[PDB]
Amino acid sequence: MPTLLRVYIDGPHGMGKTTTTQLLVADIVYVPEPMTYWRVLGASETIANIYTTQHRLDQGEISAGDAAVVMTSAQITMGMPYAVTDAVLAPHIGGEAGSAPPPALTLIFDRHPIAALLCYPAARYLMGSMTPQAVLAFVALIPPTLPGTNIVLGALPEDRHIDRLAKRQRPGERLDLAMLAAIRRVYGLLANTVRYLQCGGSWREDWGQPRPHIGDTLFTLFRAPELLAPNGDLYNVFAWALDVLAKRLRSMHVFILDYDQSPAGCRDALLQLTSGMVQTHVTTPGSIPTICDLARTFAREMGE
Amino acid sequence: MPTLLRVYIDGPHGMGKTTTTQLLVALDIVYVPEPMTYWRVLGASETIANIYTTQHRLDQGEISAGDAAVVMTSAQITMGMPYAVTDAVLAPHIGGEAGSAPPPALTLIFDRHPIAALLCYPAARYLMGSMTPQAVLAFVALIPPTLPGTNIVLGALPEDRHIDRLAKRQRPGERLDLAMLAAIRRVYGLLANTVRYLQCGGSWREDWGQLNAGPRPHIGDTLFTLFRAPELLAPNGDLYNVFAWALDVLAKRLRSMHVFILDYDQSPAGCRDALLQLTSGMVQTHVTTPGSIPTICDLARTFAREMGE
Numbered sequence: 001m002p003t004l005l006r007v008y009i010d011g012p013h014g015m016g017k018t019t020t021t022q023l024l025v026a027d028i029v030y031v032p033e034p035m036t037y038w039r040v041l042g043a044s045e046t047i048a049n050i051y052t053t054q055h056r057l058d059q060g061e062i063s064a065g066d067a068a069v070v071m072t073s074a075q076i077t078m079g080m081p082y083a084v085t086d087a088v089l090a091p092h093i094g095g096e097a098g099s100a101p102p103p104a105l106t107l108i109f110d111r112h113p114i115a116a117l118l119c120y121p122a123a124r125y126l127m128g129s130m131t132p133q134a135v136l137a138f139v140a141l142i143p144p145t146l147p148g149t150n151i152v153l154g155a156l157p158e159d160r161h162i163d164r165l166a167k168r169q170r171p172g173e174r175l176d177l178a179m180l181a182a183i184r185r186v187y188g189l190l191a192n193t194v195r196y197l198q199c200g201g202s203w204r205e206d207w208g209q210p211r212p213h214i215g216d217t218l219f220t221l222f223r224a225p226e227l228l229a230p231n232g233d234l235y236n237v238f239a240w241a242l243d244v245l246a247k248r249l250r251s252m253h254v255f256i257l258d259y260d261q262s263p264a265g266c267r268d269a270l271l272q273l274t275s276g277m278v279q280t281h282v283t284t285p286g287s288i289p290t291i292c293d294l295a296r297t298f299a300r301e302m303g304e
Numbered sequence: 305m306p307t308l309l310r311v312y313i314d315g316p317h318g319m320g321k322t323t324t325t326q327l328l329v330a331l332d333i334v335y336v337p338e339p340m341t342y343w344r345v346l347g348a349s350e351t352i353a354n355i356y357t358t359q360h361r362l363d364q365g366e367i368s369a370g371d372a373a374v375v376m377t378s379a380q381i382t383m384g385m386p387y388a389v390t391d392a393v394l395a396p397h398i399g400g401e402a403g404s405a406p407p408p409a410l411t412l413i414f415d416r417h418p419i420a421a422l423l424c425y426p427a428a429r430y431l432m433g434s435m436t437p438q439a440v441l442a443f444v445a446l447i448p449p450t451l452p453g454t455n456i457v458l459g460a461l462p463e464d465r466h467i468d469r470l471a472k473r474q475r476p477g478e479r480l481d482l483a484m485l486a487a488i489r490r491v492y493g494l495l496a497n498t499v500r501y502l503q504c505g506g507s508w509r510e511d512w513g514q515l516n517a518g519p520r521p522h523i524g525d526t527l528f529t530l531f532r533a534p535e536l537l538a539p540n541g542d543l544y545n546v547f548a549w550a551l552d553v554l555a556k557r558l559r560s561m562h563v564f565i566l567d568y569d570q571s572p573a574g575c576r577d578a579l580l581q582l583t584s585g586m587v588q589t590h591v592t593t594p595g596s597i598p599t600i601c602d603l604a605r606t607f608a609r610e611m612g613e
């Protein structure tokens with residue numbers, strides 16, 4: 001069976017992810033952000049909706065709970081194209097290519113399902129607009145990590161990123177620096193959690209508070225009072241959700257892209273990170289054509 | 305190599321599903337209750353009361369269509385949470401199908417299945433106007449992979465006996481809405497058909513234009529018919545590719561399930577016995593370790609203790 005190489009460009013927004021990633025593509029397909037689904041298809045102006053709710057809450061115009069139903073609902077719309085894409089792609093993915101020949105196909109996904117199912121929801125809770133239980137519901141629904149999941153997260157100084165973000169302002173966005181901090185922190189903890197997990201870290205054994213300290217992983221976010229029994233013990237439901245987060249993240253292949261550089265530079269770098277990524281076999285002869293079409297139809301229909 | 309028997313009893317509420325689940329376990333077996341405590345306090349405060357109140361305000365016209373959808377969707381996420389985590393932890397303990405084959409080492413009787421929270425109630429709420437079809441399809445896209453030996457028992461009870469039954473008991477927060485009752489009844493009815501249609505070779509794509517335990521049903525009698533929504537249709541008339549991909553998943557998820565029908569129009573013990581009879585010819589699965597049984601047993605035990613009653 002021929003091999004496929006899937007790469008998921010992810011990280012905080014405003015770092016130049018999309019720009020540099022189309023820049024290297026345009027055997028290689030680029031799956032963009034489902035902007036059309038966000039703005040029109042699934043609902044109208046989801047982005048605007050998200051940034052507006054926060055602001056009304058920020059300004060005391062709504063309660064933390066109103067911001068939460070809207071926020072939760074919006075996050076459902078946000079990752080819908082990602083959930084179906086993973087779901088349909090899942091059967092075609094086989095085991096890792098002996099890592100391997102040039103892959104018969106390279107998919108450049110602009111973000112992975114975890115952004116909408118884990119990262120953004122976490123950021124919003126850190127922003128006071130999502131319940132830690134809603135977040136934990138998103139985690140529980142995270143699809144099993146298919147082999148060959150290479151996530152490229154980005155690295156960029158804060159003030160440089162604020163400069164860059166001043167422009168990557170999706171339709172109806174608000175330059176919220178606290179959200180930028182929250183999301184940077186969330187993607188930071190995540191890079192740390194993957195390592196902690198890959199280095200043998202056990203959240204249940206470390207809960208009591210080489211490899212990162214549990215206090216520097218996503219597990220810290222869930223020491224939320226809402227998640228605890230009157231005796232301080234995490235409820236089992238929530239603990240089982242942390243077990244899921246743990247097995248979904250431990251098999252993901254993480255790579256870092258320093259965005260503090262020129263477009264051709266960021267782009268070159270990304271082409272560099274490619275040599276250590278895990279590729280896989282497709283399950284059928286028709287997998288490559290069918291995957292290629294999938295990717296081209298997503299772009300065509302939802303890219304904006 | 306031990307074998308496990310999983311049985312999810314599902315269907316519209318108010319049919320007596322839980323008494324009969326419990327009676328059956330009173331006759332080894334382990335019962336996994338509805339996570340009423342998660343819905344009342346752990347995940348959110350009075351989630352069921354919220355659902356019935358939100359639809360009401362929508363109905364009364366106090367809240368607006370989208371105001372309700374935003375509440376219904378968040379309420380549906382909370383309702384399904386315990387179901388989705390329990391499924392995710394179970395998954396790696398489930399091995400190949402064995403059949404019903406000798407007595408299983410462990411028998412798990414679940415009150416409802418993940419699709420109740422991620423498909424049925426949401427599809428029912430869509431029909432009630434309190435949810436959008438895009439969102440229902442969003443949930444559908446997140447329906448976890450169907451593990452082998454996924455035996456689902458749906459109930460059958462006459463519309464009238466059901467209404468009376470509903471009319472007698474009292475859920476906390478629930479409100480007698482026979483419009484939702486009919487909605488939930490039709491939805492579980494399309495589900496039953498859907499499984500059979502898929503198991504009879506149907507391809508919703510082949511038959512989209514047309515919109516065993518019996519013959520193959522007409523696509524219009526399956527759940528695919530709820531998605532002929534204008535908002536899911538492109539200008540050219542067909543469904544946008546996102547939504548059609550969601551329906552492919554729905555097909556994949558339900559075609560490997562083993563669905564059974566239990567008639568609830570009999571005494572509690574009658575139902576107890578009718579279900580004990582369907583159970584005999586239900587597909588078992590091996591576990592992935594002898595020690596998966598103890599584990600599985602305890603997971604079920606803790607779930608009950610923590611979220612039941």
Ligand SMILES: O=c1[nH]c(=O)n([C@H]2C[C@H](O)[C@@H](CO)O2)cc1/C=C/Br
Binds near residue numbers: 121
């Ligand atoms: O879950 C999400 N939620 C969210 O708030 N965003 C924001 C970031 C930026 O404002 C704009 C474009 O990424 O939308 C992205 C996603 C991505 C999901 Br895949």
Ligand SMILES: O=c1[nH]c(=O)n([C@H]2C[C@H](O)[C@@H](CO)O2)cc1/C=C/Br
Binds near residue numbers: 417
């Ligand atoms: O998704 C759901 N949503 C919903 O409205 N309910 C209602 C039914 C009844 O009124 C009450 C108890 O099941 O809650 C059940 C479920 C259970 C899903 Br698992």
